[PDB]
Amino acid sequence: ILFSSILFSIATFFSRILGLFRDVLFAKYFGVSYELDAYFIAIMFPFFLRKVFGEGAMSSAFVPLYSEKSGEEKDKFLSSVINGFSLIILALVILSYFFPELIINLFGAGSSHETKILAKKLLLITSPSIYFIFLWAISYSILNTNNKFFWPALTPSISNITIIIGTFLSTKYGIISPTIGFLIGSILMFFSIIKSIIKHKYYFTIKHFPHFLKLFFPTFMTMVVSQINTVVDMNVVSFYDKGSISYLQYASRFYLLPYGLFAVSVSTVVLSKISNDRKNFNYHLNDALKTTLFFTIPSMVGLIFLSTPIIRFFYEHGAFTSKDTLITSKILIAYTLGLPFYGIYSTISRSYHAIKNTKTPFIAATIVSLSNIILDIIFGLKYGPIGVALATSIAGIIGVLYLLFSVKTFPIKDFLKISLNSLIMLFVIYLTDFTDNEFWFLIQILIGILVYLIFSSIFYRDLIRRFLY
């Protein structure tokens, strides 16, 4: 019980790190190059189709129906879905083989001819991955365990790991080794839970699939729509320069690290403060806003200031050059500007959904999406990755404008207090940054956390109570 808990906790910790480590080795071995651009396009095909057919989609739409039924009907339904979707996916693979240029142009229209040719070959390698991802995803979604520790929960990492291995091998075989890794990963991922899926009897049927597609259409629509912004981002960026896409992905790792970090801790607090009851909506919205602001603002100041040390430490090794760190840092800065705004946006949207208000959040998301697309065209087409990141951030701002004017509430006093604290922290860090040590920035961050926490502790009687709650 104890030893198992320990080992599993270790592995689970490594799950979160493998993404970062993959990105790092991408930098070290390939840096920013047209080959890596081609790789990103080729994997972007199954990444999109994964968003449609992945474990998220199965847990949203398939798992409820499977769970409803039981006995023979359950197995026949499972078989029917695996068959129908296997057919669909097979058709998409075939369509990819015969018309690669269509897909490539779809995800990377503005790249050079060599990038597109390479992407075509790599696409040949990566198109089958979606089939095994689907088998794994549906087989993984139907698991129900009495045991405390879910060991299959580490399966998603397998793919990454294999790619990592492929990356280690690039020196001997070039970009194709990562690509192959990708493919093999998916296959292995499937195999990892084959023993599970075998247990179910196989029925050669498709009897009730069309009805399942009718029930699945909403899920599909939503997933595609969420990908639209990303695809647009990628095309705009691809136009600019050799290696623009790679720049965008390197910056993307740290784009979302604040969102990811906040999810684990901030989201529980903020959500709890968001209240379902419609009578106390405004007060609890203000409370939750105070929490959101408290965490977001200082992190934006900090991350913006320490962009270059962080990016340098994590990426600059190997093929990644100083100039690459420079441009990547710029992109991270532009994107970071939005963090406070979007955090606010998410809090408000949450609240509205909590009181069952769909219209206003929908219109907010529509505004953000359309402003982001237009601003990508305006800025990104001229200035590339940095332009697209800036466009994204500004779109966040516009969204917050609509939302704030709708709710008509904001803890401006507490906001200003927070902000001042953040600024004085920034000042301290400015003084500390004169020393030029490479690893100095970790210490800078520890210091900065303590600076902000000290001044905030001075301002608020109970530090934990007010925001941590």
The letter for the amino acid at 197 is I
Using alpha carbons only, how large is the chain's radius of gyration in Å? Answer: 24
Q: Are residues 37 and 181 in the same domain?
A: yes
Q: Are 418 and 459 in contact (CB under 8 A)?
A: no
CA 240/CA 343 separation, integer angstroms: 29
- Residue 190 lies inside a defined structural domain of this protein: yes
Task: Tell whether 286 is covered by a domain.
Answer: yes
Q: Is 247 inside a domain boundary? A: no
Q: Is 449 left (phi over 0), alpha (psi -120 to 50) or beta?
A: alpha
DSSP state of 376: I
What is the total count of domains within the chain? 2
With beta carbons less than 8 A apart as the criterion, state whether 171 and 29 touch: yes
Which structural domain range is residue 209 located in? Answer: 2-225
C-beta of residue 377 within 8 angstroms of C-beta of residue 408: no
Rounded-to-integer distance, Cα 2 and Cα 250, Å: 38
| Residue 93, in any domain of the structure | yes
Whether residue 220 sits in one domain with residue 108: yes
Domain shared by 452 and 410, yes or no: yes
| Whether residues 274 and 367 fall in one domain | yes
Resolution in A: 3.0
Within-domain flag for 245: no
351, 286 contact by CB (below 8 A): no
141-146, long-range: CB < 8 A, 24+ apart: 141/55, 141/58, 141/59, 141/62, 141/63, 142/63, 142/66, 142/78, 143/193, 143/196
CA gap 246, 35 in Å, rounded: 9
Which residue, 207, 225, 243, sits at the end of a domain? Answer: 225
Question: Hey, is 94 helix, strand or coil?
Answer: helix
The values of phi and psi at residue 112, to 5°, are -70, 165
Q: Is 60 in the same domain as 149? A: yes
What separation in angstroms does the CA of 368 have from each of 58, 374, 403, 441?
27, 10, 11, 34
Tell me: do 146 and 19 sit in the same domain: yes
CA distance 89 to 84: 9
Identify the CA nearest to 342 among candidates 254, 259, 266.
Answer: 259
| Structure-determination approach | X-ray
Same domain membership, residue 315 and residue 172 = no
Shared domain for 208 and 318, answered yes or no, is no
Structure tokens at 131: 């089939």
Q: How far apart are CA 303 and CA 295, in angstroms?
A: 12
- Give residue 249's identity as a one-letter amino acid code: Q
Q: Tell me if 355 is assigned to some domain.
A: yes
Q: Would 236 be classed as within a structural domain?
A: no
The answer to whether position 101 is within a domain reads yes
State whether 220 and 261 are in the same domain.
no
Q: Which tokens go with 329?
A: 């840092």
Could you give the CA distance from residue 188 to residue 394 in angstroms, rounded to a whole number? 41
The answer on 330 and 184 residing in a single domain is no
Question: Greatest CA separation found in the chain?
Answer: 70
φ, ψ for residue 239, nearest 5 deg: -60, -35
Same domain, yes or no: 282 and 151:
no
Cα 124 to Cα 102, 117, 356, 410: the distances in Å are 13, 11, 45, 52
Among 444, 415, 411, which residue's Cα sits nearest to residue 429? 444
Shared domain for 213 and 163, answered yes or no, is yes
Nearest to 353 by CA among 285, 443, 400: 285
Contacts of 420 (CB under 8 A, 6+ apart): none
Q: Which of 229, 233, 231, 235 is nearest to 108 (CA)?
A: 235
